[PDB]
Design a protein around this ligand. Structure first.
Ligand SMILES: *[C@@H]1O[C@H](CO)[C@@H](O[C@@H]2O[C@H](CO)[C@@H](O[C@@H]3O[C@H](CO)[C@@H](O)[C@H](O)[C@@H]3O)[C@H](O)[C@H]2NC(C)=O)[C@H](O)[C@H]1NC(C)=O
Ligand SMILES: *[C@@H]1O[C@H](CO)[C@@H](O[C@@H]2O[C@H](CO)[C@@H](O)[C@H](O)[C@H]2NC(C)=O)[C@H](O)[C@H]1NC(C)=O
Ligand SMILES: *[C@@H]1O[C@H](CO)[C@@H](O[C@@H]2O[C@H](CO)[C@@H](O)[C@H](O)[C@H]2NC(C)=O)[C@H](O)[C@H]1NC(C)=O
Ligand SMILES: *[C@@H]1O[C@H](CO)[C@@H](O[C@@H]2O[C@H](CO)[C@@H](O)[C@H](O)[C@H]2NC(C)=O)[C@H](O)[C@H]1NC(C)=O
Ligand SMILES: *[C@@H]1O[C@H](CO)[C@@H](O)[C@H](O)[C@H]1NC(C)=O
Ligand SMILES: *[C@@H]1O[C@H](CO)[C@@H](O)[C@H](O)[C@H]1NC(C)=O
Ligand SMILES: *[C@@H]1O[C@H](CO)[C@@H](O)[C@H](O)[C@H]1NC(C)=O
Ligand SMILES: *[C@@H]1O[C@H](CO)[C@@H](O)[C@H](O)[C@H]1NC(C)=O
Ligand SMILES: *[C@@H]1O[C@H](CO)[C@@H](O)[C@H](O)[C@H]1NC(C)=O
Lengths: 70, 414, 98, 49, 49
């Protein structure tokens, strides 16, 4: 439900995001690459009980270390 | 028989601004047209699939905006951390590198540009947030800048090593026809000029917010268009009233439906005009975004030989900075200065032979003749190593007598 | 009653002057255009520089300057004759106007 | 095992033309639509902007 | 309706003409003030001036 807070409208998977009220998606906090855009950095995917759609914050890419020396 | 050759140079840093994206807007057709009136909604059913087309066009524009943003910024496979050592060849990148909480007294150009740009629930309209937040844009920019600074020419398919900055600068100097022995002799002055230019740019940006007119115009035009569309709701278009309830209450259906039809036609025209103009503007902004992506690829990740594509002078390197709905580039360029006058000849007449320089031009100090590069005065004695030999002294116009030396004979005699 | 055409800001003479200044600067000066060196590089030196640019050695220009100049002049004359004969070679501008 | 190399060269000059600017036009909207009659303009004022 | 149609046509033509003008400015900068290595960007053959 775009541009809507979850306090009012669903009464009229409950979770509140910057893009709106999202129903049906399980929220994890391990970042991945974006699969289905949602908005404001939130991306969702279907990720295999409980083979459900998950919602996560998009990851910009793997980090790279590089030694230092003059 | 005269030629001018530089004896000095300066390092110049300039600025360029390009818009990238636009605001994403979605509109409810029925809410704007009728506004919770059942008779109007029933009458609107006779027009087929207008609202569908309008919504589809707006949705396509909204998608294209994020497409443009990801085309421009998402060019980097990996994330490069800022090296915890700031010991470069005397160059301080503090004002352009980030700071996790930004607690330093030195503000990044990002904050200055952001503040310079900075300085409804009842309508049928909606505005959507972009897919990428500002923090992710800043992260992409910082990673790209740090990777360019650290890995040098091994940025792509890179390794776990850091090419020293002075070597990169020397290679870039070689790129434009100046030998690196020039850089290795006044690196200190080079760094001082670079730092002074960066400071001047920061002060100039902090002076005024009027330099961002290109980015301001997009916002102004979009707001003007939206305000015009909203204000168009109050017109009568020849009907009795601009409020549906007044028409319903004051008249019977057999004329109220005609008045409502008139109002419907007017508001449909308004919506069509707005959407067409938005489509054209979206095309323009896509062209601008393509230009921005090309410039990033061809000037930030490498050195360009195209004249005046990356500012005036000879291109050395450039750095990107993020901005609201746009990007900012900082081009570093080489500019020759303090010219001098000399006498030149096309070739040198030795004993029956004509000698041409392998590189550079022949110059005369009034007494002695030398060969030097065309962008920095550095004379050398005319050796048979430096001179390409072909032909005789007959056909070349303006050839001049002189003596060509040979290191071999004194070595042989000893 | 209601239609008006406005004049362009820059007149034709100004455009011609801009073109003349640009070409004179590019011809008289060489790679020193821009920075006010203002000495005058000989033209054959610029031609040799360009010849080195396209991958041939400048002695080939210095040994055939006369023939090269003759060919250049003949090409310019051919362009003049071609322009004088057909006055409809400018299609795109005419299409815009139409 | 065979290659070809030029022995003479020629100089060619060609031309190309590019449009830059359009004709500049302004239109008196109200005078065009109404032809300077007050009855038309009074009704036109009800169409907004 | 007539006025609206004319205005829209003019807008599209203006977009086309400004694209052409951008090409013209780029060509001026790349070709008149320097030597270009891009193939056939400055006519056929190898560019001199
Ligand atoms: C070039 O890099 C150097 C670091 O290598 C930067 O030096 C630091 O600059 C900041 C602000 O420009 C200085 O903070 C100020 O210091 C004065 C000194 O009294 C103080 O009165 C102010 O209240 C403020 O704290 C900082 O001290 C300085 N540090 C060092 C070690 O020099 C420099 O800023 C960089 N260049 C530019 C143009 O920013
Ligand atoms: C031109 O070269 C001269 C040296 O040949 C530079 O002169 C020095 O400039 C610095 C400025 O940072 C002064 O502090 C020195 O006192 C100058 N020394 C001499 C002997 O003049 C000059 O800076 C160069 N030109 C430019 C524009 O930098
Ligand atoms: C410098 O070059 C000139 C080229 O003209 C030489 O002049 C000729 O020299 C030959 C013998 O070397 C004479 O037979 C000619 O009569 C000269 N012609 C002219 C116009 O002077 C000149 O000799 C060269 N200088 C030296 C020292 O050899
Ligand atoms: C190719 O180059 C040669 C030069 O080595 C040209 O030979 C001269 O050409 C001019 C005019 O074309 C004649 O007036 C000369 O008599 C030629 N000299 C000789 C020794 O033959 C040759 O003509 C050039 N080819 C073309 C088609 O112009
Ligand atoms: C939640 O409700 C508050 C209270 O008005 C509102 O400010 C906020 O925008 C709502 N959340 C979202 C995501 O809209
Ligand atoms: C992720 O969330 C779980 C609870 O939902 C929490 O225990 C864990 O610490 C979080 N980890 C991170 C990295 O946020
Ligand atoms: C580079 O680091 C080394 C130590 O790894 C140090 O000895 C050297 O002085 C440093 N070079 C500069 C220019 O600071
Ligand atoms: C070199 O000297 C001449 C006259 O001696 C003068 O006209 C010319 O301007 C000088 N060169 C420069 C670059 O000023
Ligand atoms: C020109 O420079 C050379 C080498 O620097 C020197 O030998 C010669 O004397 C100079 N010319 C004059 C007229 O002093």
């Amino acid at each position: 439900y775009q541009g809507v807070n979850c306090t009012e409208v669903p009464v009229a998977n409950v979770f509140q995001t910057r893009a709106g009220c999202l129903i049906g998606a399980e929220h994890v906090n391990n970042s991945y690459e974006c699969d289905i855009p949602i908005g404001a950095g939130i991306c969702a995917s279907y990720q295999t009980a409980s083979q459900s759609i998950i919602a996560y914050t998009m990851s910009l890419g793997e980090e790279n270390s590089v030694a230092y020396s003059n | 028989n005269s030629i001018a050759i530089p004896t000095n140079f300066t390092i110049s840093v300039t600025t360029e601004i390009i818009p990238v994206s636009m605001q994403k807007v979605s509109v409810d057709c029925t809410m704007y047209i009728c506004g919770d009136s059942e008779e109007c909604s029933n009458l609107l059913l006779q027009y087929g699939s207008f609202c569908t087309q309008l919504n589809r066009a707006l949705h396509e524009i909204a998608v294209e905006q994020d497409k443009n943003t990801q085309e421009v910024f998402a060019q980097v496979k990996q994330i490069y951390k800022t090296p915890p050592i700031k010991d470069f060849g005397g160059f301080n990148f503090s004002q352009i590198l980030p700071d996790p909480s930004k607690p330093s007294k030195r503000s990044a150009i990002e904050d200055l540009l952001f503040n310079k740009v900075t300085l409804q629930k009842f309508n049928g309209l909606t505005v959507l947030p972009p897919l990428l937040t500002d923090e992710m844009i800043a992260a992409y920019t910082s990673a790209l800048l740090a990777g360019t600074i650290t890995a040098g020419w091994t940025f792509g398919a890179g390794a776990a090593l850091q090419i020293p900055f002075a070597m990169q600068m020397a290679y870039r100097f070689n790129g434009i026809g100046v030998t690196q022995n020039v850089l290795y002799e006044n690196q200190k002055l080079i760094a001082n000029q670079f730092n002074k230019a960066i400071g001047k740019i920061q002060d100039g940006l902090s002076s005024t917010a009027s330099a961002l007119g290109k980015l301001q115009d997009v916002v102004n035009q979009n707001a003007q268009a939206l305000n015009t569309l909203v204000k168009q709701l109050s017109s009568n278009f020849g009907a009795i009233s601009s409020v549906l309830n007044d028409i319903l209450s004051r008249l019977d259906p057999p004329e109220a439906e005609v008045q409502i039809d008139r109002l419907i036609n007017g508001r449909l025209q308004a919506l069509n005009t707005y959407v067409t103009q938005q489509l054209i503007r979206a095309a323009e902004i896509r062209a601008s975004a393509n230009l921005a992506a090309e410039k990033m690829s061809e000037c930030v990740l490498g050195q360009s030989k195209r004249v005046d594509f990356c500012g005036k002078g000879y291109h050395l390197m450039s750095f990107p900075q993020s901005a609201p709905h746009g990007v900012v580039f900082l081009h570093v360029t080489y500019v020759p200065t303090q010219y001098k006058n000399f006498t030149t000849a096309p070739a040198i007449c030795h004993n029956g032979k004509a000698h041409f320089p392998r590189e550079g031009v022949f110059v005369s100090n009034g007494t002695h003749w030398f060969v030097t590069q065309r962008n920095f005065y550095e004379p050398q004695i005319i050796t048979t190593d430096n001179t390409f030999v072909s032909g005789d002294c007959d056909v070349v116009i303006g050839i001049v007598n002189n003596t060509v030396y040979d290191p071999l004979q004194p070595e042989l005699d000893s």
